Amino acid sequence: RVIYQFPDNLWWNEASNQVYYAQDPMKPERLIGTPSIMQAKLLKILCEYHPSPCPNDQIIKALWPHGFISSESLTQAIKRTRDFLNDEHKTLIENVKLQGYRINIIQVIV
DNA sequence: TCTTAAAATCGAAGTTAATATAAACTACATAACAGACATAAGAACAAGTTACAGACGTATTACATAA
């Protein structure tokens, strides 16, 4: 069981894959829900590289290894992924130009 | 009305390029010239302040796909 903490008391439980709000990681309070398989993919690419930024080419290759996909698809994926993780202030995942995207992780429980 | 000394005038252009002799010593004040210093003016570097450009990222809409 691997669980990741995000700012504003957010948690994501990967093994069962639930995003939620909870003061206690073992006791959820408000369940945001289940991210999609490609959404979990997106958080995977942002998560395996912390604290280093994940380059745009690497995430694009990983998400769609066999698809002719434009970078606009990656960017709208980030946007409509914020649509689900409710990061209105762009603080959960930071976009730094010509260097890629990052996700702010407070702690990891394994 | 008659001598007698002065006064004035005497062609244009053109060219032309000059000369050439004949007190010393001392005392003082002033001007000039040189060097060095201070000052004002400019050159160089670096920083700060500010808006705009350039491409990226985002947001929005419409087409396609899935139920």
From TrEMBL:
It comes from Vibrio cholerae serotype O1 (strain ATCC 39541 / Classical Ogawa 395 / O395). The keyword Transmembrane applies. Residues 1-105 bind DNA. Residues 1-105 form the OmpR/PhoB-type domain. This is Toxin co-regulated pilus biosynthesis protein P. Signal peptide: none annotated. One of its GO terms (molecular function) is DNA binding. GO terms for biological process: phosphorelay signal transduction system; regulation of DNA-templated transcription. It comes from the Bacteria. Keywords: DNA-binding, Membrane, Transmembrane, Transmembrane helix.
